[PDB]
Amino acid sequence: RKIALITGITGQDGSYLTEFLLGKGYEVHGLIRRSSNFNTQRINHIYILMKLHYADLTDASSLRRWIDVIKPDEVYNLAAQSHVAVSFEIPDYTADVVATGALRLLEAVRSHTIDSGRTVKYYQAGSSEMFGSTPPPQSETTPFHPRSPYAASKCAAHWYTVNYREAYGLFACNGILFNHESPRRGENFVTRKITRALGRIKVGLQTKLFASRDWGFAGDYVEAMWLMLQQEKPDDYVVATEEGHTVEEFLDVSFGYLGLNWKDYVEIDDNLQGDASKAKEVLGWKPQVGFEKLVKMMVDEDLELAKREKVLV
Amino acid sequence: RKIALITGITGQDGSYLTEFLLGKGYEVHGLIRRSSNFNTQRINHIYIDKALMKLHYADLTDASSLRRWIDVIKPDEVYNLAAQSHVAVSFEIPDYTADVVATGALRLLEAVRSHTIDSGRTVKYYQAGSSEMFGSTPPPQSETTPFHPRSPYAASKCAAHWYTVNYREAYGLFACNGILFNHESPRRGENFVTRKITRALGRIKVGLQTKLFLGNLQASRDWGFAGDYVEAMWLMLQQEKPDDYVVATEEGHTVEEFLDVSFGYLGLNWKDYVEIDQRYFRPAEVDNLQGDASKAKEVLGWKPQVGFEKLVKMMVDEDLELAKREKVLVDAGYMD
Amino acid sequence: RKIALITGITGQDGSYLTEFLLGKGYEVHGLIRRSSNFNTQRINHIYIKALMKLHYADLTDASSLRRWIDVIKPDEVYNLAAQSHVAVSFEIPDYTADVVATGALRLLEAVRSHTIDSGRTVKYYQAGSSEMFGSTPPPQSETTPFHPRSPYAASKCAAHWYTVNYREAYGLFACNGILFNHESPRRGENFVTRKITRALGRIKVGLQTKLFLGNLQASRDWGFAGDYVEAMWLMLQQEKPDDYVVATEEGHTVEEFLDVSFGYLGLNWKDYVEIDQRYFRPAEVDNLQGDASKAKEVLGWKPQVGFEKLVKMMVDEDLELAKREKVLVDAGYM
Amino acid sequence: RKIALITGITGQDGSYLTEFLLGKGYEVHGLIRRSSNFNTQRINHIYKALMKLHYADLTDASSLRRWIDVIKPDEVYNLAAQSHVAVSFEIPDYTADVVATGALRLLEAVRSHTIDSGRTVKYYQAGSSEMFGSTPPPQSETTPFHPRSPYAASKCAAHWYTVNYREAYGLFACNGILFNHESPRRGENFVTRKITRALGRIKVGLQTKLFLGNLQASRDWGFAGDYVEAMWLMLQQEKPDDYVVATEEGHTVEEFLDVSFGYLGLNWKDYVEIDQRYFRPAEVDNLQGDASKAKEVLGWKPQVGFEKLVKMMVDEDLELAKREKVLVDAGYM
């Protein structure tokens, strides 16, 4: 039975990757941060073959400890302070987690394989944010011009990973993923912010609702992560839908799906075009969920959520 | 108007202290951690009532984030409540715990000192001390009772205690150490024994749960009400001179007695649901904690208003309502 | 009187830059690490009243950085501090990244926090390295893409971007000096050039017999640290902040270095050199040669010391150093 | 062949412990920090294949565990630290991360090692009398701690992390609560070496003034060469414990001045001037240990007494000063 270790398992991607690997018969171990409040909202339904362990990317000891006890076959580093805006607020912390944290995991894995003679496949959660202002089309080889501490930190993590591959021959893959959403997307993100409101509005619990992007479904993307680690050789891959859409187009589809006009609730207050050819060719990966289905999917779940709220009220 | 800066505002004590200070007319500022999930459940109702309560992103392991907000806020009082506060968890992540509970407290102290000197302002500081620092030292424990920490968390609290005392003695910083004993409430973290019990009890009463797993039932603790204790933190900073005070009810009870009172209050025999699992036992345990709050009573005039029985019943009532709320969702087919 | 704060002042570049700035009438402050041993060998002479002040701090300690920035209120900041050895970076990657990458960010953030809190204005220099280009083919210029081959290199790439991000995001006057290999008689003895000349001078006096090296094929663009520190200062004297490659636009291999140095003393390096695998890096950087057209045209900077002169300048020093040692050893002083 | 891993091997104690263990037939490994300058001045004369140096840092957990796995040491001596008390007030955060958390990282790396490999390791923590702070003497193992500096509070923390790993996991970890100990290898920024180093230069005419701070502070001074032996002894017992290592004799900085200068026929009052900058924000007034337990259980006792220690340091620094004068009048420096 293959064993997988996931950092950032409580996040959006972690929650889906967990379900995916389980369906694959994998034994899944995830590292979680201690917090004063419930923090396993995305994987609660799963917990009730999945083990959770306390750890932190800023604590190298905690990382090596669990890798030694778990002896994973595949390690997915999805953990990070993933909010771009917030990264300007806590740059040091973000760098320590996103950049150095990644290096700690890499070094913990390399050290482990040398001490135990074992083999480990590694995945680094890269981001299209690394490209920054570089003009399209952005592929695996496009140069980075990060525009935030978060992006710069991901660039560093990307390079530490590549370095461990070329220097030690570690099976380390960099998934350069573009924006992906889902019903579990953090509410601090535009797509989820919108669908959350709509559900509330429809239920009548809410009154008002406060650069284009390549949005894909988180469920599809984690599959590409797994595919990367199943190839013969380690490599870096861009994962995107290669299509664009606007927040308004999102509003129309979202609100239109529930028979509401967005102009009755809307309250007015970069340029990434990825080439995922390599992913399609080498991994045979293809998004099986389009923009429309993704939106209506988010809307349905957020409505079910609003109703749960109306019932309580 | 008085400006207060609270670290660990999202926690149990932080939520109560916030309500208490706002009640005193304070302008409250709190530092929070970015999380992939909702993390302001305890203070949401206050924030939604940006004005008198602002929240800022920071981390006790990031010294820059601390100094930055101290400079921006120019607080009059600083309450360091932030911490990886679970004892059992500290054995699993000692390094992270130490960096936050020990060095983290030092980072704040040093950020406050640098601020007051660079800007000439004055700040009163409060450090969230714990009875856990006494460790195995026999009760009753007072301000003069020696420490003998039994976990990485406790040893880190002692360090934070000494860093604080040092900044007071070395720089004249008005810094106080609140040596608080266990204090609970309906907002207590669910992974702590008292909350874990009343939460499970409430579910059992409504048929949503049937078995409750616990560890050492013979451990004895001095349990007060967090609502009462946050007042003591405030009092400490109002005195003429800084000092350290033990805050407790001076009444001790075992976990088993907590079970008797809680379950018995709802007409059930906990022995019918409770089961023991070695996984909840800790490498090094703290057997008996009971404080002597004579100094707080005499100097701060502080006295706990909520007693043990009332606290237990308060938590049971709240968690029962919670369980019923969940029961309604299951009944309506909204919850699985 | 301008005030400059130099991190990594005890290092090679730090010592030269300090002299250069003092010669310009600057008040120089340096941040130094506490150590159980003497660690100011390169700057101790700068004393022989106090235009050079040293303060205890560390790039892994954000508070220590902001602390001296507030007290010093500098006009210019030069971040030269770093775990600068590439081979060592493969051994202690975590620490290296924390000093070279996050450490640079801590300084940047401390400077920005300082300017916003005091309304003051500060100019900032980041010590970038040609090592960032890694395996990318030469000649490498400011537009050449990076492909780091070591944790150190990757970390310098991070610092580069953090620096660029602060300039673009907050309008901070921050420049990236993309300096290529630069040696001097003060160069660390664990780097190839100094290792060679030091061993040479000693071999020449009978103090040493065998010199162990790694990859002699490695080609590099070697300049003189004394010349390069001037470019750092010029960069900050411009109207607008930018990034510049500082090099000699001439590459030579380590063997060529070995030919010139030993031959200069009429010796045949092949008679004393041996190859040890331990000195090979897990991932190597083959050829580095810069394109400093931008520095010349904009800063008006040009390297005064050529390769030959550099090698002979280093050999002369270490030879005289080896001779003095021999005298002290012969006299029973060492 | 016994294997020892020493953190802080380049420091005073590390250099003596290395010699002591090598003389005991040990294979010694030491962790050193990468630096821009030569940093092995104290152990160069040793480094002919039983002493290995590896790059690491107490603020880098990975680096620690890494070498512990490769080396698989039987005994670990944690002497690594930002050991200057005055400096600790200026860089409290770093000092804490190294002295307190750094000690915890090593303990956790050793525990993780022994659990993952099944091997056994004996651990020594370099505790200090500074932990007692202002608590009045005599100070023994159980005397309450009242740290007066970030350094001391960090040592107090390291002390408890160490005791906790012993009580919680049964790890063989001992806390050596050592009082001040000097030697000709002592750091020049410490009062004793500062004084003897200056005295020597004054005697040969290379220096004229010596600036100091509080001369009334009282300390229990022993010889590092003697103390490192107590460290080894603690780990040779059947059970782990904590022991105070001291001379039990206290003296003031002034007495140190009378003895050292008087030894060369000089009056220190003619060269010493008080500088307010050398005073610590919070001072440690009087330290005198009770090393009964060490003598009774370890059979350990100091060989070098106060005056002998002072004269030892003065002799070396005088000869060093004379040798400098010669190199000065020659153009070598």
Ligand SMILES: NC(=O)C1=CN([C@@H]2O[C@H](COP(=O)(O)OP(=O)(O)OC[C@H]3O[C@@H](n4cnc5c(N)ncnc54)[C@H](OP(=O)(O)O)[C@@H]3O)[C@@H](O)[C@H]2O)C=CC1
């Ligand atoms: N989603 C996207 O569109 C894009 C995301 N990515 C990246 O892919 C990864 C997954 O994204 P996503 O699921 O949306 O992110 P989320 O923000 O939903 O989840 C982040 C996860 O990281 C954990 N984490 C944060 N800090 C630490 C720490 N110090 N130690 C350990 N764990 C920590 C979080 O824990 P906790 O719950 O406690 O906060 C959470 O589990 C991230 O690295 C993200 O940057 C890449 C491209 C785009």
Ligand SMILES: NC(=O)C1=CN([C@@H]2O[C@H](COP(=O)(O)OP(=O)(O)OC[C@H]3O[C@@H](n4cnc5c(N)ncnc54)[C@H](OP(=O)(O)O)[C@@H]3O)[C@@H](O)[C@H]2O)C=CC1
């Ligand atoms: N409660 C008790 O009975 C006793 C507790 N204490 C101490 O008093 C304080 C308050 O207790 P309590 O409210 O119950 O504790 P909680 O665990 O409920 O709250 C801890 C708080 O600290 C925050 N925090 C944790 N790590 C960090 C970090 N690295 N940076 C910033 N913030 C962080 C938490 O944030 P987040 O929500 O994201 O996790 C939360 O706000 C704590 O220090 C605790 O150890 C002392 C004696 C008694």
Ligand SMILES: NC(=O)C1=CN([C@@H]2O[C@H](COP(=O)(O)OP(=O)(O)OC[C@H]3O[C@@H](n4cnc5c(N)ncnc54)[C@H](OP(=O)(O)O)[C@@H]3O)[C@@H](O)[C@H]2O)C=CC1
């Ligand atoms: N010289 C070259 O050929 C090239 C160098 N560079 C870079 O330019 C800078 C200067 O180079 P160079 O003078 O030769 O390097 P050195 O290695 O000689 O000097 C490094 C300096 O950084 C200090 N330092 C290291 N770690 C820390 C820390 N954690 N906190 C504070 N200070 C620290 C060192 O202190 P300590 O003495 O205590 O060790 C020393 O002062 C470095 O960043 C280097 O990487 C760029 C291109 C080429």
Ligand SMILES: NC(=O)C1=CN([C@@H]2O[C@H](COP(=O)(O)OP(=O)(O)OC[C@H]3O[C@@H](n4cnc5c(N)ncnc54)[C@H](OP(=O)(O)O)[C@@H]3O)[C@@H](O)[C@H]2O)C=CC1
């Ligand atoms: N000496 C005394 O009188 C007393 C001292 N002690 C303690 O005993 C120990 C030995 O003392 P002593 O020899 O005099 O101290 P020194 O200051 O001479 O030596 C300290 C050692 O620790 C190393 N070190 C410092 N920081 C780090 C770090 N971050 N990572 C790795 N290594 C590091 C130093 O390296 P580097 O050379 O690079 O600086 C040096 O090898 C110390 O822990 C000290 O605090 C306790 C009681 C008494």
Ligand SMILES: C[C@H]1O[C@H](OP(=O)(O)OP(=O)(O)OC[C@H]2O[C@@H](n3cnc4c(=O)[nH]c(N)nc43)[C@H](O)[C@@H]2O)[C@@H](O)[C@@H](O)[C@@H]1O
């Ligand atoms: C004062 C102190 O109170 C709390 O620290 P404590 O360790 O005293 O609180 P906790 O409620 O966790 O445990 C109290 C005692 O009950 C035992 N116990 C029995 N079964 C269980 C169980 O299943 N879970 C937990 N968590 N504890 C259990 C414990 O072993 C212990 O003996 C925290 O809030 C600290 O942060 C704070 O400093």
Ligand SMILES: C[C@H]1O[C@H](OP(=O)(O)OP(=O)(O)OC[C@H]2O[C@@H](n3cnc4c(=O)[nH]c(N)nc43)[C@H](O)[C@@H]2O)[C@@H](O)[C@@H](O)[C@@H]1O
């Ligand atoms: C520009 C770059 O220069 C320096 O980094 P570098 O790695 O370019 O310089 P170094 O002198 O270490 O090596 C140059 C080339 O020669 C090879 N070499 C062969 N044998 C040896 C040997 O024994 N020791 C060393 N140190 N190098 C050896 C190296 O492998 C490499 O190919 C540092 O100052 C960096 O901080 C800076 O960023």
Ligand SMILES: C[C@H]1O[C@H](OP(=O)(O)OP(=O)(O)OC[C@H]2O[C@@H](n3cnc4c(=O)[nH]c(N)nc43)[C@H](O)[C@@H]2O)[C@@H](O)[C@@H](O)[C@@H]1O
């Ligand atoms: C035991 C303890 O000893 C040492 O810590 P200490 O602080 O005891 O050593 P130090 O020699 O620095 O000071 C001893 C006492 O003399 C006073 N003193 C007077 N003038 C001066 C002066 O100019 N410099 C210094 N450094 N000290 C001066 C000090 O204030 C103090 O009262 C370190 O080795 C620690 O790491 C170790 O833990």
